């Protein structure tokens, strides 16, 4: 047997892990990861199987983007297969996976224009050109919704197919399904992956110990490339992934009632968003703040939580005001610096990644786990991932007059989103004096890459030391690419 | 001989057909030009007919019917206009400012008002076979709002527009003196009658001046001038002061939109609207309050109010612009919500009033229904429910009343906007239901006001409430 | 038997425990109540030594409310020799009990001027009349708070000697106090006292088994009354105990910093506050909400999360926005019906009560441990309690009139700590519609009682059958002591 | 000839007018202006005798501001017996000029702390070191105001002996004085002051008349300047005067009734602030905005109406809410690019200017009006206003770093004040980002010349072409005067 180990025990590396020890009887499959899911991205995710849900104005009119969309249209047809053999390997006690079937994105006013009615748009036009089964309804026929009347939705559309998971039941059922196939759970953590000879040899753990490996595959979340990174001139090669830092909340119902689909909006300032995840037994998820950090971050901030519960009891239930919180979850949403997943293999034989899905790895995790698994056993995967190999130049998606459009706009969003109360003058006074300061980073940090708007606010108000670091890292990856 | 009692819209449009249609007959109009509470020079206006439907009004068979009647007016502008026109030169200036209207829907104010109503004028269009069409809120031309105020649904109406008031009057008042009528610029102190007839007016120089016909349209002064006459205290409907806040701005760049900007009717028969104006100004209205005496002079709170309302929810740009004028005016409100049109049991005795938010748009059909009746026709087949002698309509139950008027009261806290904690909406529904349940009871058995008559009531002295549960007591012995 | 139970483990039963086992060596004292101490007001505390913090005009009206003031005034004096006795006990690494020594309280326009300008003159005058060292202060000479502007302070009140506790710290010292002077931890709850010939035999606990007893003090905090109603008589004799629910939370301080004094307002609507307690380790205690409930509970509602970090951010500290959020703590205030703490002997022989003491059980605690003790020894405590005997006729401290003033009051004070912002119409019309509906409230329940504004809010929104139930109530209480 | 022409009739002209024509009995003194005082500040004004209450932190750091308040506090000591000559030459159904003796003072948090907190300090400061009667006094004993509780005052100073005068009845009292004492109203405009070999020949007026004489007071408000500036060499020898346009209401209160006293706020963002002074016949007058605007304008904006209105409603007296609005009064406050009073002679003999007075010259009045009678009878007039000549290079009252600290305090003053409701992250973004726009403004403005706060916003938010014509007339001053 030819063993292989998998780094992380979130939604990507148990699914990879699944994956593995199903359709491979010739290896050992041993997968790294403590109970604590420490920064764990998928344990704080309600969680939305979002394609259409996640479609924004910014990221279709990008050729990476438009690929990244058409592979989550591609994920969403592998979930019922994929849930009933999770289920298969329980029974009835061990709770459903599914929680809902449908979406409703709701529009408000509380929010941008610029970036609320635009993506609005962008949904609509989206799931028109894709033929996916959907109907703009009247906010009237929108259940169990009860939004302050000045919060309130004026349209929803209805999204047949696009539904949610309870993150928590798919983690139990994944870890149940890869020990049925013969995999085996060390509850430690990878410190080291060791290499020579251009091979991996396998992984040092933080208990001391040496596992050897003819395969490795990284999906630690936030802290893949961190991980990789030690190895020699990957540093710059493999891009970075940031904590992309997301609060959510459960929430026991006043009266234990709950939507019978998502409620949503679309994606908002900073690829931030407000929804409701079904769960059962009187339960709703509510989410979802995001924050870029240089650092991991592994509890909620007060203006987080104030930001999310405000947000859900005036927009979504004022029911929810009386509601019993159970728990405030915290968890780093891989934000890779470039805006693109890194799925696939390295010029390391037997070194593979699963990292850099930021809003929606959990989604995409059947698709992706099939891609890799194919690559490992020497076929060609899905086609279209070919662009998000981990070992790559920065990705450009976008030019940096649209970065910085997008920064201000997202900027502005804050406040539109709190939603503030100004004199009508201010408004345009911040957006005249927010150009500058932000053209002005852009031309610093680099002569060719730009940061993504969720990354640029980050870099603006971080430590000169921080900025100066990044200018360094990006000009020695231009360096190593050209 | 003829005589006209009033030199509003109403007034001067009676005035105007009778001296074109009777050039035998010797007509005078009086009033004043100082106009005092006079709802036309405040108006912007409007020739509203869709644009003022709400779900409420077209619940009830006497609101279908008032509808109709706008929409037949609608048919009239053109003709009239072009007749208005012609009396003048270039240099009068266009009576018509816009040809369209947009209404839009925003969340700065009660889903189930503006909610309700914006569906209501969306069926009643479709019902009248209007031409219309539900448009991108990006295609409405002009508009600037605060984000957070902006509306996310837009209907653009064709054939509703508006007139400048000001320009209206100058046209009838030059019509009216070329078709031969005299303008006589002082106030009725008194009908004259005996042997069941009328026999002219006392004027307020001392002057009588006699008459064969005499026509009330002296607005919200209209029923206390008749009611002096024997009987008529408590067989025609009480009128009150919808008193009415609008302004002129002269735009920070001269600009103005090509339609007419609104939304629905709404708290207490407020509303936000934009009309056109020639030479870089723009009207924005209206405020309103039901007044049990008359007003004069805009309160701080509807000038705020009304400002606050245009500069987030139509054009920030607004924010930065020149106030040129506050316009003050009370709509004629009647007592049971309805017009009082036609004829009295007195000969040659007729009135014009009572029609609070449309009487300038409905001016043309009204006018020429009062001309048929008076030469001894039928006039326009769907008035005969808004005859001024009449027993109190009571076109809605006690129980929609006391869920409007509650809808309303919490209305004026959304469209403001407030920001409250969350309990408090429902803790002032469940507490405003009670007192409004107990008004209602004590006013009378029988007769229940309307919303915005309800509130003024409910807040007026107590003197006040026991004068108007002896008045409807008063109408009730009269009739029943 | 001499066996002494002590039936709870909050501040009251542990002290008055170590104030017995250290005076009595001869005696086995037996201390009942678990380590999740369910409902438990202690752990949620800061806590304040609060006596002049917690002054109201409305307090200092009536002369229960005078009487009440002069013990948390003479419970201050006790506190350093308290504490000393604790921490000797301990070692080093126990930590401290005292965490400040001092409090400034800030008057702010975030509130009723009904309320807030009332107190803060209140305050001011009955630290004149006590002589207590104080002194009014500039609002820039108060260290380390950083308000929003529109909600800051305009003054500021320096009181000496009146400071905190940490309340963990408190709990562990007395725990280990108390197995230091012989005392014993059976961590079980008592279900029934068991009492004939008119006295006690001992407890019957939840694992089914018995104690016997000579004495049995009750301090179970908002159980206490519901444990004692059950024996014969003593249902309409011991005043009814509520759940005062309150919020608080642990937070980690941006930069680690702390204020050297309590800061705190005075007390606001229906008996909440705000307030920050320094702690060690660059944690901060923020507090704290209130809420009678007629039945318990254990979560926070949204609602109390979002006012309690609205106001702490804008009013003491912007910096908390960015603070990491480490906990949120309820607990249950002992919500006497009658406003007055229960503190004494019963008419069963051995049975005490050390109950209803609401917002400051916590800073009298060492002066009511004494005061049970003195009795149990054939003394007479403390002057000035005997009026709180726990066995009484419904205290009724103010006229219906005062009471309707203001609950009236404290009504329209939620909309201005929100604070809200109305049409200025609004604020008069709700006045005028309150009076009304509370006005007939009061007139129902009964001809002589009248439930404190407190009790009488959550009775309006109760359901009818809990009001008809309370109706019953003051009418069987009328009939036994009339 | 010793004819003298007063050019202007607001209460400066007439004030000197009164004065030169009392003085001079033997003298043809003939004072132009018409009814209309079109853009004039007097009619517009309240008016208060402000001295005291005008104090801020900032003037009172500067030489040239302790002067002018100096002088302020001199004009003071004029008012009794100033009205009492007034009054003399009319009868009591002329109406009283006084309309209150004394000034209450409110500090609320609508404001900017380092404004309104600095400023209360400075009054009080400056009433202490002048040894002026005034008592910091309870806010509940402050007669007549309602306020929101949110917008309260939570400290109050009454000032003695600063009271406010009926501008309409003033005006109509100085020129019956001026009539009676052989003054002649000539109500046409001067077009052109007349003057060669160094001497006023006289006046070219708007009906194309010439008026000869040997002395010409400009007392012309903010036309005073562009009226000097046509003379030979003047244009760059006279600081211009811009127009300070303020917006102030007249309201007919719900029951008749107003304060005994002036109530006002220290000066607010760019000299604008907050004010009610009392009138006869249940009239208040409510001020008052201020906005420098480098054209002329005679109507109010939408904005000033509705800030003004709020402000009054919320901070004074709510009952003004359902008050009838009587009339919307705008005046231009003649506002010197320098920010010092223009008062004197110039090198033309017999021309003389006292204009540039800001928010004060109804105040300073009968000093101003004595001063320039002591000079025109070769005197030296009153001490102290020598540095205030109106023919002088600009004053430099502070360096270009107190101002940018001030321009942006005033900026961010402009939020506090509204009361905006944002994130409380905004604020410190905000004046973060407004820091290098103001510094790269005032660098580009002038090496030597830095306007203050109230006009360097207005140039900040001018054309392109208005920042450039003023970079040319400093850059002309400057070459004139070095
Ligand atoms: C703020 C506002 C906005 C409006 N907007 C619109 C709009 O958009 N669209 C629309 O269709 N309508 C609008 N209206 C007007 C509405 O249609 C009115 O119902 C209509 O203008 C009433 O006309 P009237 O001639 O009956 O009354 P008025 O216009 O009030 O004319 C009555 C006249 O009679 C005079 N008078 C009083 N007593 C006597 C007497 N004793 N003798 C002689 N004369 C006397 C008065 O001084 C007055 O000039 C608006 C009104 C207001 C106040
Ligand atoms: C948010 C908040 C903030 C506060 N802040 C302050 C402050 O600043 N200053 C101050 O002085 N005080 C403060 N207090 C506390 C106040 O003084 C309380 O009145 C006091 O703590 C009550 O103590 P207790 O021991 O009576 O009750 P508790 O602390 O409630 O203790 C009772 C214990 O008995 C246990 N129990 C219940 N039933 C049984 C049973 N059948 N058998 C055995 N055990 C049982 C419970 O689980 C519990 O642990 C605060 C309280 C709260 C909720």
Same mark, same amino acid.
């Given at each position: 047997?030819?063993?292989?180990?998998?780094?992380?025990?979130?939604?990507?590396?148990?699914?990879?892990?699944?994956?593995?020890?199903?359709?491979?009887?010739?290896?050992?499959?041993?997968?790294?990861?403590?109970?604590? *899911?420490?920064?764990?991205?998928?344990?704080?995710?309600?969680?939305?199987?979002?394609?259409?849900?996640?479609?924004?104005?910014?990221?279709?009119?990008?050729?990476?983007?438009?690929?990244?969309?058409?592979?989550?249209?591609?994920?969403?047809?592998?979930?019922?297969?994929?849930?009933?053999?999770?289920?298969?390997?329980?029974?009835?006690?061990?709770?459903?996976?599914?929680?809902?079937?449908?979406?409703?994105?709701?529009?408000?006013?509380?929010?941008?224009?610029?970036?609320?009615?635009?993506?609005?748009?962008?949904?609509?036009?989206?799931?028109?050109?894709?033929?996916?089964?959907?109907?703009?309804?009247?906010?009237?026929?929108?259940?169990?919704?009860?939004?302050?009347?000045?919060?309130?939705?004026?349209?929803?559309?209805?999204?047949?197919?696009?539904?949610?998971?309870?993150?928590?039941?798919?983690?139990?059922?994944?870890?149940?399904?890869?020990?049925?196939?013969?995999? *085996?759970?060390?509850?430690?953590?990878?410190?080291?992956?060791?290499?020579?000879?251009?091979?991996?040899?396998?992984?040092?753990?933080?208990?001391?110990?040496?596992?050897?490996?003819?395969?490795?595959?990284?999906?630690?979340?936030?802290?893949?490339?961190?991980?990789?990174?030690?190895?020699?001139?990957?540093?710059?090669?493999?891009?970075?992934?940031?904590?992309?830092?997301?609060?959510?909340?459960?929430?026991?119902?006043?009266?234990?009632?709950?939507?019978?689909?998502?409620?949503?909006?679309?994606?908002?300032?900073?690829?931030?968003? !407000?929804?409701?995840?079904?769960?059962?037994?009187?339960?709703?998820?509510?989410?979802?703040?995001?924050?870029?950090?240089?650092?991991?971050?592994?509890?909620?901030?007060?203006?987080?939580?104030?930001?999310?519960?405000?947000?859900?009891?005036?927009?979504?239930?004022?029911?929810?005001?009386?509601?019993?919180?159970?728990?405030?979850?915290?968890?780093?949403?891989?934000?890779?610096?470039?805006?693109?997943?890194?799925?696939?293999?390295?010029?390391?034989?037997?070194?593979?990644?699963?990292?850099?899905?930021?809003?929606?790895?959990?989604?995409?995790?059947?698709?992706?786990?099939?891609?890799?698994?194919?690559?490992?056993?020497?076929?060609?995967?899905?086609?279209?991932?070919?662009?998000? *190999?981990?070992?790559?130049?920065?990705?450009?998606?976008?030019?940096?007059?649209?970065?910085?459009?997008?920064?201000?706009?997202?900027?502005?969003?804050?406040?539109?989103?709190?939603?503030?109360?100004?004199? !009508?003058?201010?408004?345009?006074?911040?957006?005249?004096?927010?150009?500058?300061?932000?053209?002005?980073?852009?031309?610093?940090?680099?002569?060719?890459?730009?940061?993504?708007?969720?990354?640029?606010?980050?870099?603006?108000?971080?430590?000169?030391?921080?900025?100066?670091?990044?200018?360094?890292?990006?000009?020695?990856?231009?360096?190593?690419?050209?």
């Amino acid at each position: 047997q030819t063993d292989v180990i998998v780094v992380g025990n979130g939604v990507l590396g148990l699914s990879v892990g699944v994956e593995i020890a199903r359709t491979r009887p010739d290896v050992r499959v041993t997968l790294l990861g403590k109970p604590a *899911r420490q920064y764990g991205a998928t344990p704080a995710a309600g969680a939305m199987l979002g394609a259409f849900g996640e479609v924004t104005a910014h990221a279709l009119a990008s050729e990476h983007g438009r690929k990244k969309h058409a592979l989550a249209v591609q994920a969403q047809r592998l979930w019922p297969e994929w849930i009933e053999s999770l289920e298969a390997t329980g029974t009835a006690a061990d709770g459903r996976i599914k929680t809902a079937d449908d979406t409703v994105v709701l529009l408000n006013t509380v929010g941008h224009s610029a970036l609320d009615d635009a993506n609005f748009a962008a949904v609509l036009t989206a799931l028109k050109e894709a033929n996916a089964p959907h109907e703009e309804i009247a906010v009237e026929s929108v259940d169990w919704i009860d939004p302050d009347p000045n919060s309130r939705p004026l349209r929803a559309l209805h999204i047949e197919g696009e539904g949610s998971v309870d993150s928590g039941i798919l983690l139990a059922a994944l870890e149940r399904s890869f020990l049925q196939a013969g995999g *085996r759970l060390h509850p430690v953590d990878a410190t080291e992956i060791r290499a020579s000879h251009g091979r991996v040899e396998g992984v040092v753990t933080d208990d001391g110990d040496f596992l050897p490996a003819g395969h490795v595959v990284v999906a630690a979340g936030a802290r893949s490339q961190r991980l990789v990174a030690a190895l020699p001139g990957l540093a710059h090669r493999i891009p970075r992934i940031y904590d992309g830092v997301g609060v959510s909340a459960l929430v026991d119902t006043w009266d234990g009632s709950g939507p019978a689909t998502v409620l949503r909006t679309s994606n908002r300032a900073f690829a931030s968003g !407000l929804h409701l995840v079904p769960r059962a037994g009187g339960s709703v998820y509510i989410g979802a703040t995001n924050a870029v950090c240089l650092e991991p971050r592994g509890a909620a901030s007060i203006e987080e939580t104030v930001f999310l519960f405000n947000c859900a009891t005036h927009q979504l239930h004022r029911g929810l005001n009386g509601s019993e919180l159970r728990k405030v979850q915290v968890g780093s949403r891989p934000a890779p610096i470039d805006g693109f997943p890194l799925i696939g293999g390295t010029s390391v034989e037997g070194l593979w990644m699963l990292s850099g899905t930021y809003r929606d790895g959990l989604h995409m995790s059947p698709l992706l786990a099939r891609h890799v698994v194919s690559l490992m056993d020497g076929g060609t995967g899905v086609d279209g991932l070919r662009e998000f *190999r981990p070992e790559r130049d920065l990705i450009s998606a976008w030019s940096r007059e649209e970065i910085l459009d997008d920064v201000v706009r997202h900027t502005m969003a804050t406040g539109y989103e709190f939603p503030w109360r100004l004199p !009508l003058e201010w408004p345009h006074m911040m957006e005249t004096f927010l150009q500058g300061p932000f053209a002005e980073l852009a031309d610093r940090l680099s002569d060719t890459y730009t940061p993504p708007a969720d990354l640029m606010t980050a870099i603006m108000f971080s430590e000169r030391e921080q900025q100066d670091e990044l200018i360094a890292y990006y000009a020695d990856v231009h360096r190593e690419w050209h």
